[PDB]
Amino acid sequence: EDDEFEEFPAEDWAGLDEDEDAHVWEDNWDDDNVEDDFSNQLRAELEKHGYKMETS
Amino acid sequence: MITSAAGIISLLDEDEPQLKEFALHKLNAVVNDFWAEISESVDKIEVLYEDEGFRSRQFAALVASKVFYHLGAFEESLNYALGAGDLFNVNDNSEYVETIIAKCIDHYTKQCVENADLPEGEKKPIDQRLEGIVNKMFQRCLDDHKYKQAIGIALETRRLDVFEKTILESNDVPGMLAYSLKLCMSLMQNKQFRNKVLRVLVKIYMNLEKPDFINVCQCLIFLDDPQAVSDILEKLVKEDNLLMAYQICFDLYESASQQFLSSVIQNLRTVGTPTLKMIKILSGEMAIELHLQF
Amino acid sequence: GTYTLIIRLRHNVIKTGVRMISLSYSRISLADIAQKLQLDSPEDAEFIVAKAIRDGVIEASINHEKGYVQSKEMIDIYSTREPQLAFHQRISFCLDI
Amino acid sequence: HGLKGLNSKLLDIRSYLEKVATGKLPINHQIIYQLQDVFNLLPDVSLQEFVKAFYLKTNDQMVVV
Amino acid sequence: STQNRRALDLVAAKCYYYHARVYEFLDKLDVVRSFLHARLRTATLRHDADGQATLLNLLLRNYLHYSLYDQAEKLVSKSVFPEQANNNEWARYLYYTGRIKAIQLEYSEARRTMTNALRKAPQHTAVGFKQTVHKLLIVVELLLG
Amino acid sequence: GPAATSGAVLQAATGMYEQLKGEWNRKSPNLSKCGEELGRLKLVLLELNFLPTTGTKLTKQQLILARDILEIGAQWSILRKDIPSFERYMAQLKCYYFDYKEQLPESAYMHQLLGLNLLFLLSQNRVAEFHTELERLPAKDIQTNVYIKHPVSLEQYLMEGSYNKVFLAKGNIPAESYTFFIDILLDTIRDEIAGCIEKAYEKILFTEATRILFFNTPKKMTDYAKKRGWVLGPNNYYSFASQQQKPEDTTIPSTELAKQVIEYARQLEMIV
Known part of the structure; x- marks a missing residue:
């Protein structure tokens, strides 16, 4: 008989870093791969490769 | 690894009989935390145990019995334990004989049952070294004076010589006679063996102290040899022990049945062929009268 | 004592990178397979893919006289x-x- | 118990065919006739397609189990 | 606890547990490994399931705190973990046997034992134990593919 | 037998394991005879009672002096060859590499013999043990001892088929004893490579097959295009054995799946 644990260290915290909150979210591993990169990724790719001047 | 006999076991590539002996002592000492691994390399030990040229086969027999003692499997522990010869014994008082004598004694009584009861190749399968461990332990029961223990062991192995010497030891004769009547009536199942205990229970009511004729009577009832109770009753009547020839006939009437009471009066008539007071007690006439008056 | 298990994952990041390319494409050149996987050479790629195949983890084929996996x-x-x-x-x- | 039927029915036909072939018993063309329709009707010739379908209908069966 | 009777074995479960814990600071004495061993085989013949399991756990923890994985593997195999055991004990054993299966290149069994482990640790709290079995489960799935 | 006659056997091993290091330079056939007598001075050491340590400091400093006698003897046990030969030594030593942490010092010759203990488990194709063993030496040591790093990454390439592993079997020269033994593995490598290529392609030219299996000549490649059974047209042509005949038969399932169905029924009918 036992009922305890005390053989492994733990971590307890009140400074908690943030992620996507989960309440019934689909929690897709796809949305952690981006950073709202999507406006940036357009602008920079329309100027760099000139597809806002050469190509409509 | 440390605490792994990998360093030990991997030895024996050169054939140096002093490399096998120094090995089966450094291993034999520590089979109490290495075993789990030994299990994998038992073959090096069995091959050594089978070859008789090596004198190191007594510890190979022990170390072998030490793999199946810590594995729990047992069974094989008996074949290697008895192959250790005198290194394994009852008196060195180890955890090995602690367990291995339970496993031995049950492995042995299992055998003497099926064997002594059925074939004519009875003991032939049975090893003699196992009987030696059984008798070495049993005599410990007669030396410790635990006749209260040996009285039952003597029905496991089902040898009545064990049982016949257990009763004689010390002045514990009239008590043992009290155990062996309770077990002959409740414990005993096999009618054959039960009868074989009752006969030896008859001989010790004659050759031990004053014979008690209230006991040999009951036992002759359960053995059903009428021609012998008729002559145990017809030698106290000739010696003017009628006071002890009544006690036999009232037992026979109450305890025994009518086809026994008709065999004994018939044996006294075949003997009487070239008075009759006991013929009036074995018939039950006088007892009928007494009960009526009652 | 986890670090012993971790270093092994190099097998699986490439197992998946490549089983992912197989389900993204229908045929591609080894020169590009090495560029998406951050692999070594176009020499290394062909061996890696091949291994995948023999381990039924990609079900494809290779034409080497033209340089593409299919x-x-x-x-x-x-x-x-x-x-x-x-x-x-x-x-x-x-x-x- | 159904196979216990098919088994002995077929068994009886086998004893009959074996009965006319040898240990002669004059042939009755009609029996043998019908006995040919039997071996044409056995489910065989549409093997591959049938396989691919039967597997699918099973798949459904499990979904609902 | 060397004494007799079958009820003291149970409280000796807790005894052993703290015994090892304190023995483990200064330096996890491998000396105790033998005591444990000796008291373990004894328990297998007294058929004290409880003590047998608990004790077997602290033993496995001994082999694992050092690099004796082979020695725990051949053991885990050759031995029979009791049937009745407090769950805490069963979670320990299912975290260790899974650790072992993991190291010897067998992520298969592991991912299925690992998980059973996470789901036997007491629910409301168990902070550290759960916190570590995660750090391993997360990697056994990755490794598995 | 005092500890000074035991010592008098240790010096009798200094006269044979400095001749093993002087016949290593000259590379004589007397390099073989100073190791046939360190396999005899073994059988003289175990009688001076120097089996693995279980206490006693006097025997401890006598085991740093009997450990050597198995190092420099094991090294010749390799070049002497035979599987069980250099095998049954490695045991002893990995045992005396925890005794060496116990109460003894360490040497730079301890973690490089163990490395060979790894390579030996690669050419025996028992990668299950390689990893257990890899976990005996602390993790921070396989990044800094760049003698062990090559056995490790050799297993990385080995387990997940990546080639350029035949090229790195002559580039792991920082420890020469690696390049002596690893040659064994190179006959399994060719086998796995052709095992995949039997399925991965269908037409290549012959000289390319000579460039892939790491051969230099055309002759060798004829023999190995004969054992696998290929034809020798202008380009080396393959035979389809990847999925020669498909599993288009669920008649083979048939019985098995029916067993399963029956089983479900048993669980829905049993008395629980």
């Missing part, structure tokens, strides 16, 4: 037993409860 994918999963094996798993678990 997928053979065209199964509709249902001709497999796979779904029936998956269910045979589910309901044994479930029923045991």
Whole structure:
């Protein structure tokens, strides 16, 4: 008989870093791969490769 | 690894009989935390145990019995334990004989049952070294004076010589006679063996102290040899022990049945062929009268 | 003592990178396979893919005289037993409860 | 118990065919006739397609189980 | 606890547990490994399931705190973990046997034992134990593919 | 037998394991005879009672002096060859590499013999043990001892088929004893490579097959295009054995799946 644990260290915290909150979210591993990169990724790719001047 | 006999076991590539002996002592000492691994390399030990040229086969027999003692499997522990010869014994008082004598004694009584009861190749399968461990332990029961223990062991192995010497030891004769009547009536199942205990229970009511004729009577009832109770009753009547020839006939009437009471009066008539007071007690006439008056 | 397990994952990041390229494309050149996987050479790629194949983890083929790996994918999963094996798993678990 | 039927029915036909072939018993063309329709009707010739379908209908069966 | 009777074995479960814990600071004495061993085989013949399991756990923890994985593997195999055991004990054993299966290149069994482990640790709290079995489960799935 | 006659056997091993290091320079056939007598001075050491340590400091400093006698003897046990030969030594030593942490010092010759203990488990194709063993030496040591790093990454390439592993079997020269033994593995490598290529392609030219299996000549490649059974047209042509005949038969399932169905029924009918 036992009922305890005390053989492994733990971590307890009140400074908690943030992620996507989960309440019934689909929690897709796809949305952690981006950073709202999507406006940036357009602008920079329309100027760099000139597809806002050469190509409509 | 440390605490792994990998360093030990991997030895024996050169054939140096002093490399096998120094090995089966450094291993034999520590089979109490290495075993789990030994299990994998038992073959090096069995091959050594089978070859008789090596004198190191007594510890190979022990170390072998030490793999199946810590594995729990047992069974094989008996074949290697008895192959250790005198290194394994009852008196060195180890955890090995602690367990291995339970496993031995049950492995042995299992055998003497099926064997002594059925074939004519009875003991032939049975090893003699196992009987030696059984008798070495049993005599410990007669030396410790635990006749209260040996009285039952003597029905496991089902040898009545064990049982016949257990009763004689010390002045514990009239008590043992009290155990062996309770077990002959409740414990005993096999009618054959039960009868074989009752006969030896008859001989010790004659050759031990004053014979008690209230006991040999009951036992002759359960053995059903009428021609012998008729002559145990017809030698106290000739010696003017009628006071002890009544006690036999009232037992026979109450305890025994009518086809026994008709065999004994018939044996006294075949003997009487070239008075009759006991013929009036074995018939039950006088007892009928007494009960009526009652 | 986890660090011993971690270093092994280098096998799997490439296992997945490549089984991912197989399901993204139908045929591609080894020169590009090395560029998406951050691999070594176009020499290294052909051996890596090949290994995948022999371990039935990509089901494709290679034409080496032209330099491209080509997928053979065209199964509709249902001709497999796979779904029936998956269910045979589910309901044994479930029923045991 | 159904196979316990098919088994002995077929068994009886086998004893009959074996009965006319040898240990002669004059042939009755009619029996043998019908006995040919039997071996044409056995489910065989549409093997591959049938396989791919039967597997699918099973798949459904499990989904609902 | 060397004494007799079968009820003291149970409280000796807790005894052993703290015994090892304190023995483990200064330096996890491998000396105790033998005591444990000796008291373990004894328990297998007294058929004290409880003590047998608990004790077997602290033993496995001994082999694992050092690099004696082979020695725990051949053991885990050759031995029979009791049937009745407090769950805490069963979670320990299912975290260790899974650790072992993991190191010897067998992520298969592991991912299925690992998980059973996470789901036997007491629910409301168990902070550290759960916190570590995660750090391993997360990697056994990755490794598995 | 005092500890000074035991010592008098240790010096009798200094006269044979400095001749093993002087016949290593000259590379004589007397390099073989100073190791046939360190396999005899073994059988003289175990009688001076120097089996693995279980206490006693006097025997401890006598085991740093009997450990050597198995190092420099094991090294010749390799070049002497035979599987069980250099095998049954490695045991002893990995045992005396925890005794060496116990109460003894360490040497730079301890973690490089163990490395060979790894390579030996690669050419025996028992990668299950390689990893357990890899976990005996602390993790921070396989990044800094760049003698062990090559056995490790050799297993990385070995387990997940990546080639350029035949090229790195002559580039792991920082420890020469690696390049002596690893040659064994190179006959399994060719086998796995052709095992995949039997499925991965269908037409290549002959000289390319000579460049892939790491051969230099055309003759060798004829023999190995004969054992696998290929034809020798202008380009080396393959035979389809990847999925020669498909599993288009669920008649083979038939019986098995029916067993399963029956089983479900048993669980839905049993009395629980």
